[PDB]
Amino acid sequence: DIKMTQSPSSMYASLGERVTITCKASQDINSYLSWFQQKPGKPPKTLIYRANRLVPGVPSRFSGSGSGQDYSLTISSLEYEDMGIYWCLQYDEFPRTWGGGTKLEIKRTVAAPSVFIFPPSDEQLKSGTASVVCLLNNFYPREAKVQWKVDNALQSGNSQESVTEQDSKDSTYSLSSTLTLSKADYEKHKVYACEVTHQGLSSPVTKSFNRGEC
């Protein structure tokens, strides 16, 4: 199989900047190389085929270059809609093989998150589990740390989190973390706290509630 390697795996660029990303094959692929853009939850969209041929309807700021093993895609001047994941495909031989993708995101100013904590609902407690949720709203850059504490005991291994992407409406990230406890354990403790560390905060921010207090 022909191995396709893309670089960088991810990067940021500012509005209007020139962007060049690379795709290298483990042998000469005779310019049978295509480039694609993909947005979250959506199919690939073909940009360029045979290394340098633009698909009709693709803006001319996109161009492709290279031969042999080494190929590149250039965005001459980045537009906001160009965020997404860029993939390359070789179709010189079978199997057709893909690169691992390059994620392209847009630079913007630092933003500290606003933080919110949510107790488990009475409706959920009826059935034996408690989910405590911590929201980090609209922050940049993406690196953020959530630490959960229950009566000052650091929780580890009992939370999961996920993060939103930039899109047409948002250039910041948001993050949701869920701490899961049994109802029995939830009712044994009082102070539920989410502590957030982020570069935009002078010091970590803690949001907390006391179980059973309005």
Next chain:
Amino acid sequence: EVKLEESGGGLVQPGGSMKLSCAASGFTFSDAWMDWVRQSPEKGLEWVAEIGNKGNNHATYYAESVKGRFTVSRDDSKSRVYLQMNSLRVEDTGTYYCAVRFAFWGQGTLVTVSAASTKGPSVFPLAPSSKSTSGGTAALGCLVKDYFPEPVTVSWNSGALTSGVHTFPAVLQSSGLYSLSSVVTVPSSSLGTQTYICNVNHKPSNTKVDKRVEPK
């Protein structure tokens, strides 16, 4: 305009079979060679199968991972390409796309190979906090817990509220069920006067829920 539309996906048990179909329009179908490509978080994009046009007598080609189990075929009179998948494996899970000449793509169809049963979600409120004081911004949401398989969608106020909404990627819990949250930020001063309803759809279980979220 070229259009492609895949159908036939859903949940199927390991060792089972499933047939995908791709309906095409907007090009001369019999002259086009076609491919199936699948995608997962774990493996990225993977080419699955190709079927030629008349120029190579509709030659077919397969990824080694699916050879002997999958069959690509076409019906030119129907402008359809098909993928018959037998002896399915967990690692065959993914979003399956049909493409014409690697140039135009369908929207994809999600194939989940799992022994687990379909389960609709419970929807719990993430209620706006009583501490607040107004002239500020409050957050509220819905926790869509314990469903299988993906996906779920969430809207607010039947689509009338979109600014400030964040609907997060689901997490797979150790139980094997997914959980997802959706939140919105709104003026704290609005909490006594505005109604907020999350509209949750889990099509795999035919489950729809509208959950009003109120303080306290």
